[PDB]
Amino acid sequence: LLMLYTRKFEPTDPREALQYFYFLRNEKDNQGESMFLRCVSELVIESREFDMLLGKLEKDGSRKPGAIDKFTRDTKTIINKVASVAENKGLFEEAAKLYDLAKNPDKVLELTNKLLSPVVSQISAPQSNRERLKNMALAIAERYKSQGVSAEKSINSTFYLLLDLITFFDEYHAGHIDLSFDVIERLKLVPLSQDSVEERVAAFRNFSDEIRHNLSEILLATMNILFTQYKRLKGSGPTTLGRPQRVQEDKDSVLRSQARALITFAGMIPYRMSGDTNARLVQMEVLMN
Amino acid sequence: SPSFTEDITLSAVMLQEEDPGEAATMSMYPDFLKSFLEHPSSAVFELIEQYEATCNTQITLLKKIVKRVTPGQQKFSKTASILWLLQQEMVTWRLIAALYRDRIQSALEEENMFEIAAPNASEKTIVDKLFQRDTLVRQSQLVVDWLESIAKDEVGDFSDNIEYYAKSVYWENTLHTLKQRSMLSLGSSRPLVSELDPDAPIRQKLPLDDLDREDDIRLLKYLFTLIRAGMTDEAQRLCKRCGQAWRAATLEGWKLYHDANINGGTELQAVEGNPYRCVWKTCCWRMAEDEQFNKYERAIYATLSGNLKQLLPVCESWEDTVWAHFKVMVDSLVEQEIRASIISFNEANELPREYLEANWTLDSVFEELQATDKKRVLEENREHYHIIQKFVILADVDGLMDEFSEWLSNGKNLLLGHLLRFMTHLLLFFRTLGLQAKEEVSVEVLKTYIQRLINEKQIELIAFYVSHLPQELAISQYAVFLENITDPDQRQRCLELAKEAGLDVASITKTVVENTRKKDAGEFAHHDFAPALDSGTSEEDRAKIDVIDWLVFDPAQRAEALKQSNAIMRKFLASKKHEAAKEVFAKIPQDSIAEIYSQWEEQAMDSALPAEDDNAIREHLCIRAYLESHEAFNEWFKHINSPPQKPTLVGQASFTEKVAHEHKEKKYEMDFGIWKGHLDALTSDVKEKIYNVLLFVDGGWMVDVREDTEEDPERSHQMVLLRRLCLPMMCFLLHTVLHNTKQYKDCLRLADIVSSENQKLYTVFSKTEMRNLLQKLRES
């Protein structure tokens, strides 16, 4: 009877349905959870409206009170459980926003990693859902920077690393090869000499499986830029567009050291990657030397 | 019958819902197809009776639903309206079926129409001659039989229902009041008849009592309806109920006279009536010109006269007005050949000149119907069923096709799935009659109908109806269908149903393949490395991946499946999705080439074996070899990069530490031996396969016998591109491996051997590349 009568006005304004739910506080299941909890979760899913129910952050500050806050207590637990059911239904962005309301950055940062890692792996096109996810993630990052909100430092550093990675790929896709270059050496993941390979090894075990996957694309763009540099220098002789031959030769020698170190590390990584990636690594590096 | 029990019971099990009509609609079609199974396509009439019977059972089903609806719910008012449209389509079935069975009988009997004779015997000879001779009146008679069969079906048991309408006291109120006037101290100041005559009041102008006259009017509804239907047995029934045996007598003034007792003893052949009937109808004609009647008598005898103006008042329906058209024209005709057959041309009856000389045709039926300035008939005229059935009568094929055109212009929302099916049966019986309608309109209707049909899915339904199409369209639509059939159970079931009901599935799968090829394609570049900033899976990529299943399901499609799979392997690699290539290789069996070879052998025929199957064998093998050498090089590269351990180099330590160093050195011995053995085996195998793909077919690659630009110029372009792409680095990697293995003597002979223009392998290296190989030979 109750649930059918709720059906009579499910899409009505929120708090109205809330007093209906309020009667269901006394009711629950001895086989698990409460009908109250399940219904509030499902209906707020249908709602996608929160600033009145749980309240809202002014921008990111204190949570302004919600409607249920007046008649109910300890609403952060409801926040967490509801966003848990949301992500169980795959409602990732809204669950993340709800934990932003909850002040629980851990799952927020984890999930934004799983969100950005695929979209980061595509080209930089204006008005893209890649850009949407980028924007929400950078908003999260800026909020936590301003707030001093600190997760496990491993995840924090990896996330700042990722953000710098998007900066890199944006430069690459815009064709600002020099800017992307500067970005990568300040990212200091550039093994110019063979001695940086074991440093890259040390960096590797710091990584989770997902970024371990994405290192392949990272090094792909890397060798792309490297080969462009070497070929452009080779095409620039001393009688064409300047760039004297001695400087080009010395820089190409340094670059060849870098490329051979890159291939050595690519071979001596500890977990298996794509054989296509391996072959392409080797064949652009032969083009390099 | 079980059909009625099923109707009521499923009405109970179905009323919970709110759209039972379409559920029953789909429920109809399996019966359609089963019936097509049990009976042939020359038995279309029995098909029509089974149509009507089953759709009548469903009529009853919707009646049961609508009546089981509680008051105050028009949610099933839609159900009742659809049920109404259902009865309209039913009567359309009756109309067309009878009309064209009469058409068939006419076509059978065309060569003996019309007669001539002179009066020699009883006038029933005149009568049955007249009935047999003409067509126009014949179909008029049949359509009248239609309408009044409708009427009597509506009637049914009005007999048992009048059990409760009955009064058998003649003018009881006038009776009792004149009795009390004669009976009491005080009479009444009220005028009444002294006579019981059916014309006692109006002849005497004297009043009658309201209850008297109004139970009269009530029985007038009863019998008026009964005879507008002509329900004559019930007519004499009601007469002999209420004691109007006078009126029952009045009923007989028109039915003619006969007798045939020219045989045997004095026995009844016919005694029926008074032969004064021609003049008696003339008398009724003039009584009509006299007017002053009740509605009922006015209508009945203006009917018995076919008097148009005094028949105007009572008939206002579309059915009533067309009915009256037929009645009037049938009468005028029938009396015309009465006077024609019975020899006379002098005065024996009087009628107005225009009535005598009015001509009659089936065109006039609908011209009158249209020209009716009565808005009831006018609005009924625009109703679809009416237009449909009057086109049925008229055979106006151009008007029908244009009208269907405006229907489809409005779309399919006005033409529900059952409407589309009904127009479909329309066209079906057209064809089984060898009558052909306009084909683009037909295919438009059918495609919209099949759109419906697929909205209601049910693989068992689709194939026969699709079998009615232009070939390209039928192929495309069964493709759209079966590509959703993705679970092997109903998949194979759909294949058996398709092979049973037409449109083989194999050509369907191929057509899916080339349509997929037509939408999307992969990269092509014989220059080093595929251009991209970031790369990943595409919708086109997945579509090309997943079009394959349709071919791979059928074991018989293996040849073309392999051909297109190798082509898409080419697209994989040239679009830099070798991972897609390897996944598809894992998907496809490794013995497919041998299976195809064995199958072409098993037919005991190998002469018609073209270059093509054996080519497909070569592509499959060449992709296998190139990919395998690829992961072999990668495996050797990863293995060499994984040393067992470095030698222990710690200095002075403890005795237990010395034992630990000895254990470390022994472990180093085993690991180094195993790792080096594997490394050298991998090195040897890698160079072996390098030569195999570098010294294959005169050092060729992807090479094939048929590179015809008549078959595919793009195939040749792709293949030369593949060689120009893959050859350079393959040679350079061989140079690097041999140099690392200190095989510089092999580098010098291998670097000097890279010109095979026999199988397109001598013009794949470039100026900068040949410079690079010059420096490689220089390092060696």
From TrEMBL, chain B:
Subcellular location: Chromosome, Centromere, Kinetochore; Nucleus, Nuclear pore complex; Nucleus membrane
CC annotations in GO: cytosol; kinetochore; nuclear membrane; nuclear pore outer ring
Stored InterPro entries: Nup84/Nup107 (IPR007252)
Gene Ontology annotations of biological process type: mRNA export from nucleus; post-transcriptional tethering of RNA polymerase II gene DNA at nuclear periphery; protein import into nucleus
GO molecular function: structural constituent of nuclear pore
Quaternary structure note: Part of the nuclear pore complex (NPC). Forms part of the Nup160 subcomplex in the nuclear pore which is composed of NUP160, NUP133, NUP107 and Nup96; this complex plays a role in RNA export and in tethering Nup98 and NUP153 to the nucleus. Does not interact with TPR. Interacts with ZNF106.
PANTHER family: NUCLEAR PORE COMPLEX PROTEIN NUP107, NUP107-RELATED
Name of this protein: Nuclear pore complex protein
